[PDB]
Ligand binder design. Structure first.
Ligand code: HEM
Ligand code: HEM
Lengths: 298, 298
């Protein structure tokens, strides 16, 4: 059972995320996904230069109908966390395209619109870009402790056996940064908000940083082992308008993601992530990405 | 006199254009431009291999004020052409940033906003990207006959002497492509529309292509010599929403640009550019880019 090509590649330079709702018969998606998968393989062969991959994933209601209610038992509609502090915008279809080349990405995105256009209504399209030194627009490096290498990323993100082998759970959440509020903070204040030093990007030990620090919020364990995720987030936006981080995570279990959300947004222990001092999520949804084999034969 | 670094570089991968109006006192721009140019010089040293360049240019009324009526006598407000076919959105300040790296462009743009933000209200920010094979989103190679090499480009784009030595005239015009309308045309018909063959990008002899063809519209001569411009246009937009070409031209004389506009939009001989079958301009403005010396010396 083959994984879809966009989950495992590391250090993309650019990505496109399309979120869309079914219009009409959900069953049309079966043929759309096969058409797009074929176009995608063609682009991957045409531009090996790009290290291109993509993922098609589906929301609870849509996947339940496409799978006939079999498998993906964890999948559910994203609903608001923190009593609304993390809003919900659950759509039916997620397409995630990533590579080293924005120009190739755009061609693949056009192919996706051609494949799905008559079956969906697009609600969001975000073009992510890797920024200097792989930093978030806040000036902090983003990705350091992400799982590295195919073996470890596969362990964290790709379902290993069962009816869903080769699939993955996906979470996407667009954040809007208020950089003027960030810059009112001393660098020490910022570093206590994140849990790592800003320029040097060294971790502050768990006892030196407040329990509201981001790293304390998301360093969660079960049975003494950390709940890991594979993050494909990138910056997005304009300099003069809206900008921030398009957050994107893959995980073999929805649980690891949900537990970090419950932690960050006050649900678990009443404390909230200190990053909410300067940035806020404005979308959110859960999706199931089937194995490529399952995607090809819906 | 030194030219601003953004005019002459060839084959940028990505650009950012910012159009803005003055908010308070126009004289605040004097310190804003010096601050930004200082910041730009720092990014050009920090990223010596990115081919980074930027241009600050000014609308008619804002330049008259900043320069005490001195020079830039050609500079005027952009006004509609073709009885409204080409609308006018003349603003006060144009900032154009280009390089091989979008991530570096975004840093420069943030610096532009840190420097001009208090003094202006941004009307538009557009991120351009070079597409596959340097093709416009219509599928036609864009740029083939552009002036190449620093000598020829300086002849065309940089003012040679006089009070304005080192400066240039800029025209920006965002177009919205309707690729559905494009793809209803046969390839032959598209080629007759542009004036070059589509895949091979070979010229079609002027006698074998309609006088409404783009090339016939824009390949103009005065006194037996071609009216050249230096184009920096790039594709922009999203696959599912608005997309097209952000047109951008530099010229030593406003006359070369205006003559092509008069031709394309039916004002010269009543014939209109055949590209209007599928795309349309929705903005337009004229700006004056002073040499880098005046920009620091305002
Ligand atoms: C629901 C949203 C998010 C989740 C679930 C999440 C999850 C994580 C995880 C699991 C880590 C690695 C922690 C470790 O084991 O060391 C991490 C690190 C980090 N995150 Fe978040 N993150 C989220 C949102 C954000 C946002 C919005 C930003 C910035 C604006 C951000 C910036 C960072 C930074 C700078 C690091 C440290 C560098 C790294 O290890 O990647 N995160 N995040
Ligand atoms: C939707 C907007 C436009 C598109 C898709 C477009 C596309 C093209 C293409 C495909 C070429 C031939 C390849 C090349 O030599 O670059 C070309 C040439 C050219 N274009 Fe455009 N163009 C657009 C707008 C404009 C405008 C508004 C102007 C001038 C005001 C202009 C001026 C020129 C010039 C001067 C040439 C070179 C002609 C020659 O000497 O062969 N273009 N354009």
């Amino acid at each position: 059972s083959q994984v879809q090509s966009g989950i495992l590649p590391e250090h993309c330079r650019a990505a496109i995320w399309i979120e869309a709702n079914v219009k009409g018969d959900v069953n049309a998606l079966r043929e759309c996904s096969k058409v797009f998968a074929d176009k995608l393989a063609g682009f991957e062969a045409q531009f090996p230069d790009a290290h291109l991959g993509a993922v098609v994933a589906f929301g609870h209601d849509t996947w339940r109908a496409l799978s006939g209610g079999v498998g993906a038992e964890e999948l559910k509609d994203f609903t608001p966390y923190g009593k609304g502090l993390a809003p919900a915008t659950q759509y039916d279809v997620l397409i995630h395209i990533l590579s080293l080349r924005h120009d190739v990405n755009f061609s693949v995105a056009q192919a996706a619109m051609a494949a799905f256009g008559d079956a969906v209504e697009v609600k969001e399209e975000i073009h992510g870009f890797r920024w200097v030194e792989e930093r978030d627009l806040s000036g902090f490096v983003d990705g350091t402790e992400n799982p590295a290498g195919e073996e470890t990323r596969r362990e964290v993100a790709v379902i290993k056996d069962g009816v869903d082998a080769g699939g993955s759970y996906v979470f996407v959440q667009r954040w809007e940064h208020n950089l003027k509020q960030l810059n009112r903070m001393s660098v020490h204040d910022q570093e206590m908000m994140i849990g790592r030093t800003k320029v040097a990007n060294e971790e502050i030990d768990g006892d030196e940083r407040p329990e509201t620090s981001h790293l304390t919020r998301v360093d969660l364990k079960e049975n003494g082992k950390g709940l890991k995720i594979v993050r494909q987030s990138l910056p997005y936006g304009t300099a003069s308008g809206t900008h921030g981080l398009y957050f994107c995570a893959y995980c073999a279990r929805l649980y690891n993601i949900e537990q970090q959300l419950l932690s960050m947004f006050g649900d678990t222990d009443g404390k909230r992530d200190a990053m909410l001092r300067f940035t806020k999520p404005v979308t959110g949804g859960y999706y199931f990405a089937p194995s490529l084999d399952k995607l090809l034969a819906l």
